[PDB]
Structure formats: structure tokens, C-alpha cells
């Protein structure tokens, strides 16, 4: 948990296929009272992020598994 | 010369008569796609042999 700072580091398209635009990882900048710690979570979760109103500056409750 | 000419001619005729594709249907499906299609793609990649799974998400256009 912590204040989120969403950012997607652009990555080359799937190397197994052609070229284009893809996202291999999604970094979330969870900031807690003790400090800050960015998490390079799986990109498939991006759907959940967009589902809820997860904007930069709110507290999110992430689950490990 | 004329020999290879007739060979290629009858080979083309045989190909035509035997043609009496799924890739073309996939390309048609692509045509029908409005264009902003996001593809969820995950493949097994190496680190049975030791390996792992990697996830990729391709975005067609910058709008999405």
C-alpha cells in the first residue's frame, strides 16, 4: 500500500513477433509514511488499475498473489 | 529452354487444378478490427529444461 505514482516504461514490441508498441512491465511508485518503494509489477494487472479510479495521489491496497 | 518452359507450364496447371487459406481468413479478421486492438500475449521464456513465463501486452495505437 501507499501513494501510487503510475508509470509504464516503454519497451520494444514482443520480440517473438513483429514490431510496434508493448509493455513488458508496469512500475507503481507506492509511497508510504516511512519512505518510497517502486514495485515493478506484472503488466497484466494494468486492467485492474484502469478498472478502479487509481490516479496518482491515492492509496491502493495491493495483494501479493 | 522449351523443356523447362513446358515443365513450369504444366506445373502451374497442376497447381491450379489441385487448388480445387486460414491465414487469409485471419487477415480478414484483422481487416474487420477497428484498429485500436490491445493484445494480451504471454509466452514461456528460458531463465525438462529450466524456463519461466513472460507477459507482453501490445497496443495497436497510441490512443489506447
Amino acid at each position: 500500500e501507499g501513494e501510487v505514482t503510475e508509470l509504464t516504461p516503454c519497451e520494444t514490441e514482443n520480440p517473438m513477433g513483429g514490431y510496434g508498441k508493448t509493455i513488458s512491465h508496469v512500475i507503481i511508485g507506492l509511497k508510504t509514511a516511512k519512505g518510497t518503494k517502486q514495485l515493478k509489477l506484472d503488466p497484466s494487472i494494468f486492467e485492474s488499475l484502469q478498472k478502479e479510479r487509481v490516479e496518482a495521489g491515492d492509496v491502493i491496497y495491493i495483494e501479493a498473489n | 529452354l522449351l523443356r523447362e518452359a513446358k515443365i513450369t507450364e504444366e506445373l502451374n496447371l497442376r497447381s491450379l487444378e489441385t487448388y480445387e487459406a486460414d491465414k487469409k481468413k485471419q487477415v480478414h479478421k484483422k481487416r474487420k478490427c477497428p484498429g485500436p486492438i490491445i493484445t494480451y500475449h504471454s509466452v514461456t521464456v528460458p531463465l525438462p529444461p529450466a524456463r519461466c513465463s513472460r507477459t507482453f501486452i501490445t497496443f495497436s495505437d497510441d490512443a489506447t
Partner: peptide, 16 residues
């Protein structure tokens, strides 16, 4: 042979 080059490129991307 093509799949071999594809997986080699995937391994190069993993190393990168």
C-alpha cells in the same frame, strides 16, 4: 530454423 532465431532473439532480449 526461423523459430531458433526467434528464441535466440528472445534470449537476447531477456539478457538485455
Amino acid at each position: 530454423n526461423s523459430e531458433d532465431a526467434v528464441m535466440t532473439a528472445v534470449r537476447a532480449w531477456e539478457f538485455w
